[model samples]
Target: MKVEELAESISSYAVGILKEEGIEELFPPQAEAVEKVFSGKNLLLAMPTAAGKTLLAEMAMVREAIKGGKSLYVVPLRALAGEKYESFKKWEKIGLRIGISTGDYESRDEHLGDCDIIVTTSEKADSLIRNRASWIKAVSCLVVDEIHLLDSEKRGATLEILVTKMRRMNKALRVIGLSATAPNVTEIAEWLDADYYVSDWRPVPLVEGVLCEGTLELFDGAFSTSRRVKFEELVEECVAENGGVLVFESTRRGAEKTAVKLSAITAKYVENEGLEKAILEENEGEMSRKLAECVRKGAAFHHAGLLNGQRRVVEDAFRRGNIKVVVATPTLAAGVNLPARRVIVRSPIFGRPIKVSEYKQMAGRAGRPGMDERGEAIIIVGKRDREIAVKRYIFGEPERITSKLGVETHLRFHSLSIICDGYAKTLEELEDFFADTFFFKQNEISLSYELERVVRQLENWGMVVEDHHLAPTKLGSLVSRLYIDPLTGFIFHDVLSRMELSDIGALHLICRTPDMERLTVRKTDSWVEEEAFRLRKELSYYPSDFSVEYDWFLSEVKTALCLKDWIEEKDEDEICAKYGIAPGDLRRIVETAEWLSNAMNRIAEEVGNTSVSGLTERIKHGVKEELLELVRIRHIGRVRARKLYNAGIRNAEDIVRHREKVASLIGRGIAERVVEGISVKS
Candidate 1:
């Protein structure tokens, strides 16, 4: 269908914007999906990457906005949320206000109520519902991007619960689930009562093949490569064709190694002088330097270990075609759309063969629309495994997605959420709610026993109380509203109520929770145990040396020590070095720590412990108590605050009295802002 001939339910301004953006016509699948969307029924669009699914979702959102209703777009990742938020900015010209919320889970984000469209992560969307945002009922359309995450072990349950809860709130809500090509779309659609559209449509054709003994065999033809290295030759051929390549590795070390190896071939394609300058001028961290080295050679490694700044720079460079090759873990497949003309899936990431769905996801990253006529996905395999790889990965169907909601942790988490939010008043109501979920639909099993077990666990934990009806205790209410695991809340309640913990103890307490990802205890790192023993007095939940959980406890201790270093004004590079973590790993740890610390602080408040009140702010700013006052001013971070404190200018008032000294210590531009910001706040 022509873009200009969009359904009359969509405004002319939206059509005009589409045309201006060069979307002259919709693909057949998109047209079909759009028609289904306007029918006021739910839609499950099972399509491949770059197949106009997002466009169809945008059209649906525009239609919702036209009707004076709102659209809530939920994604699975924070980066994807930001991408959608920025891309949707163009709609503001059509008089639609767009808003985004990916953090601060405790708040209702009342400011977003004014938005015609809102983009957020699935977890944040669940958080919004739990916090009882007033605008939720106004949401006429809910678009779940990457809806196939309903199969994810860690995050699927939240997506399932969010959709279930949202549908119950607004029975008229139009749900648009944009999923990868999965075998179970019909089953999923049945669960949603949505009309399902499964398509093999793509803006650019995808050609999948396997590479064995350096011979690239595709569905139609084969390439007899003369180059020495198979992987290098694949990248070289793609770069020679004026196309970018995305190499999928299993681990961070593997990604870095592959990128370093591929850089020799890609260096001839382009040189990223600006990338080198950016990394050099920032910090001299080993990770940054290694990345800069690769970037300068026209290749870069991408994973969760690189700092956010470093990752963004690499992503921008790759998108701009300056970096011709990027070696990354499979995470890149699930993140924001950064397509390449060629994708190479290296082996050993197949130490066990990855899911066909995951391979398809990585393969789909090839062939950005308007850039390449066709995409190439090559799986490098050993000679012995080529047949199996070809049969299983190249030609096999993706596995059917199943609900991950039956797990104990997710069961406990969402059960408390539903009850605390008043979706269920009794065990019967709760069991009925779970019965209506995809979990029940797929398994054909009643969740009555499971829900009973979870409720009993909640009751045992004192989070749930039974009278004539099931209700949350005050702590339970806080935990649900706080969007934390009930186990995390229980741990906090048990520990803080028993003893007043010091800063290390507090940091360790939050780190010990299931929420924080602890660093691995390396075989060579005996210091973790030594330091664990040293800080045993400050540790709140110190385990005995002979316990099987001693290793797990050491990892948590190592993680808390990393946080301790962070708050002590340690450089990111130093923290990464000391903890054997990457900058991105440290960043994730800090962010999670900050959130858990805040949750811990709130729990502390409820349990009559004031000692933990200031810990969250300290963790957030990465500063000690002495620098907290100075760090509150605009443009002042841990580094600047520590510098000022060391200079004997220790507070906002000190800054006010020593303006010249502040200027000499931390530049005039920031000093002026610091003085002005403090005065303005005053």
Candidate 2:
């Protein structure tokens, strides 16, 4: 069917709900774009905020789902998944089962298999693929919401790798990339091998400008020469004049501060109007209601730190046009899709304040589609930051795509895992696979070299054997499958294989120690100091006599010790609180442990001796259990474990070997009992 015809079909199927909601017209271009999507072409749709992009995705998903195909919707934030999940709930009446998986990184939802549509974050999706989930291959359509975030440094590379890995998993997988606005949509399209569409046409035309000298001046070509004004003042004026306003602040504190100032200003304005008497007298019983009524005409702040229910209340009120103005941090720009006639940027010059691409992305939130005749964007500047603003506005260019090789050292480990799992044959084969990536296409020079360097490093570490055909050694396969940095994995293997089982814990701690080049004392604040003391205390209880520096070296030593402890116990909460680490950190530690365990097992198996085999199994099972248990603990982390290990005990066996010594060192009778239990069980 033609694109327009398919759109008509979709409208005919769903217009009743839209009309009931009082939306009379379909976003024409978006409807037409859906038709194009039906043709099996990848699409990069750059539309303004609240421009029916969600509807476009919905229509496509529904169309596919109705035909008995699965649709996967990928988002940048967990909140976005929640938002879309709610939106998708409406389709349940149409007999479509929708499932959402956000931070549930374990993929515990077996119901996802029964759902026609799935909404998830990009990271979760990547993990699902890495774990080789079977359902992924059945997906018919993949929707990447907020595709412009691929420009973000911290998350961009991961998303990039995700898309590449997914495409490789199924070459024919249909991709739909959505963005608010991007200066370089062409590059994104080319990378995804998709058709690109840039629609400057919002449902509402947005007028861009700057608030200068207490006046909202039209943004001319000289965005660089615009004067500045107070953001709170502009928000107050806009709300007073326009009835409602949406203020975007760059940071959390900035949002709160702006809202407080605007509220104070609004209160004074009402008092000057002599409305305070009326507010106190007749409305005494309804003071809060009356105050809210007045405050509704002022400004309110919104950010993630607020409870979920509070955010929902504010969002619902803002949608009803009850709140006069909302001061929000950048997070609001990503997924809410709320529309406003005027968008005032309280921050200075935008564009990737951090990256050129990111700045443009935040600025793109200015215009809301379909609600107003024209959306307005105003940038308020401070006196001192004026020159900097001008320079940013004039010279801002989207950041160039850089090679992911150096930044994605972690990803390379995953790719190597595929080879070890017998999924791929060689490094060259993996390179060919990755050549289908946006990163590879955008920056060719360094990627090729980086690939060579990575392979060489793997070989140098004895991960791969080189000859006429490349093959992963037993150790190589173990390292790859362990899913950790090869270096860390190597360190783990070396320490585990050479050290006596009784001394493994201490050696594990030493090997995992954080004594890298970047060690520092100034970074150790109260939280760090507290953790350091805890780890130090834990270390002192170990049976061995290893001395760890309590100052700068303590932090690093603590981190290493925690990893070792995790290798033996798998206590997650302990790992995190002890080292102030995240789940991702624990995952990396486990991955390293897996590699070490596998490498030792492989070498023992190659020797084909019963004693070596039994020893290898003992070491592998002990380390694996410890690491897994550490993941479950609240505060005892890899770093803390390493600290404890370094003090004297290496592995569970070591603690058992010198129970009395460990008990005395730990200064707790419980320590000896726990060691005895672990030893007996092992």
Candidate 3:
């Protein structure tokens, strides 16, 4: 079929399906663009929320699937994947099977073999490529939903990496990028090699303005000081006219504060005398119910920190148009396709004052296509931040895209692991691979200088020994394969190499504890008293001739410091008393210290570190039998092993023969394992 004919045919089929689902009038421009996208052409779609963008993408995917091609849809957030999956499932009548994979990284289900369309977050998809999952090579079309987030600092880099990796995996990959508004749409268009469609044409026209001092004024002309208040009055007017309103507050605190203020103001407007009587007589819980029965008939607040059921109740009422006002956080801007004839930004210039790109994206939420002839977005600026707000809202530019090139200890370690795992043959090969990223493409900065600096540092640390060219030594590869931060690994190894096996616990405590903050007064006082009591009891338990060692108290202080610092970074003496640790607790702490020391030595052996033999003898020799027995207990992972040891079980023999006593302390299954593994003859 020809491109135009293919588009028209798919559009008709999609519109018919939408109509059956109670949706009619798929936006005309979006319908026209569907043809170009379905023809395997790269395109950037800029459309308003609830304006049929998702429907268009669905149509394109369906058309591709019908043509025996595969389509992969990528979303910015994990929460959006489930909804997208459900929406796509409606097209099962067309013989398209949809699958969704979100958080589980270790299990990349090969069952995607039978699915025609797959929905996933960008991060999960990237991990699949890094682990070399086999199914990625067959993908034909890649849809990047919410493509505007390529500007986000933390997540944007990952998205860029995934896109570049996918494109490399499949040379014929057709890219479709979706967004609401971006300043440099052309740059992204060129990056994806896709056609750009930038439109201010909403199915429902949006009137932009501000509310000042209880009145509303349009923003099309010049700046006005009174506009902010006018916007609030306009909200009242909209609620009066439309029967309800959905107000987008900027923050959680703002949502709560504004909801209270608005609910009070709305109470005066309640015309129904009977409802006013009910509201005045109603209990606190019924305040919303009573107020909702007043004014435009309903009102409430919505934000993240509120329990899920609370938000859902507010959302359901707002959707039913029974709620007169919903003061919510900006999170509402993303999910839930619920729309009102009016979207008022209760404070336009709120929060950290985001870029024009962000403002435009939020503003795009104004219109609900087919429902309102025109939608309105009114920003109410505070008197203080008005000037800065105007510049940002009116003429501010989007921030420049920057590359992440600095080699932090974490990334340095990750790069080493990549090399050790045979993902790349050499450091230069890895650098060459990263150069293909958009981070390198967009930024003018070079990473070579930074790479050289990290290489030198690695050499000085004995992680790598350089000849003419750079190469990881046995120690360097070991550091990489352990998958730990380089600085942490270095500190751990140094402590192991220098400290005796018996002193390993104290060393691990020192390395692990933050030791920067003080304990609360209540905790400090309680701990001191508790530790004194425990020490007194332990002194009495031992033989009369046996003198209590001063070092035991010192060890207790040190052990307490380790726990305190590791958990909350309070004083060691204070934490010891707070948890009421005794001689038994001290003994357990020593055992756990021995166990972790041994685990690290084992890892060192796997990395071919020659130093492992010496360290193993010093740390694991005495602890080997005890540490192995400790690991056999159920629910005893490495972290818990340390906790149990610090609590007082010194040896497996001590635990197994005294199973009933241990069970009272550590619980049944673990106590049983301790007994069986240690006491039962082999």
Best by lDDT: 1
Better of 2 and 3 by TM-score: 2
* Candidate 1: tens digits of C-alpha lDDT, residues 1-682: 8877884768878889998898888888888777687778899998985777888888888888887789999988888888889999999998899999846758889999999999998889888888888888888899999888899898789888998999888888889899888877888889989898999888898888888886777763233232234767778988877688888889888899989988888888778888887766556688788889899988999988877778888888888888888898877737666769998998445446588888878887888888788888888888998898888888888899999888888889999989999999998899888887889889977778788899999998889898889999998999998888899999999999988988899989998888787888888889888988888999887775667788789888888989998888888788888778887788788889998998998888887988778888888888888888888788888888989999999889999999999999999988998999888988
How many clashes would you count in candidate 3? 23
Model 2 C-alpha lDDT per residue in residues 497-522, reported as the tens digit of each score: 55333333332333342222222334
Model 1 is weakest, by summed lDDT over 10 consecutive residues, at: 220-229
Model 2 C-alpha lDDT versus the unseen true structure: 0.58
Residues 266-311, candidate 3, lDDT per residue (tens digit)? Answer: 5554434443334333122332333334323355666544333444
Q: Candidate 1 or 3, higher TM-score?
A: 1
TM-score of each: 0.95, 0.65, 0.63
lDDT leaderboard ranking: 1, 2, 3
Ranking, TM-score, top scorer first: 1, 2, 3
Model 3: residues >4 Å from true position, as ranges? 1-19, 22-26, 220-232, 241-244, 248-251, 265-298, 308-313, 331-333, 336-338, 346-351, 383-391, 395-423, 452-682
Of 1 and 2, the candidate ahead on TM-score is: 1
- Give stretches of model 1 more than 4 Å off: 221-229, 350-352, 652-664, 667-682
Q: lDDT (CA) for every model shown?
A: 0.85, 0.58, 0.57
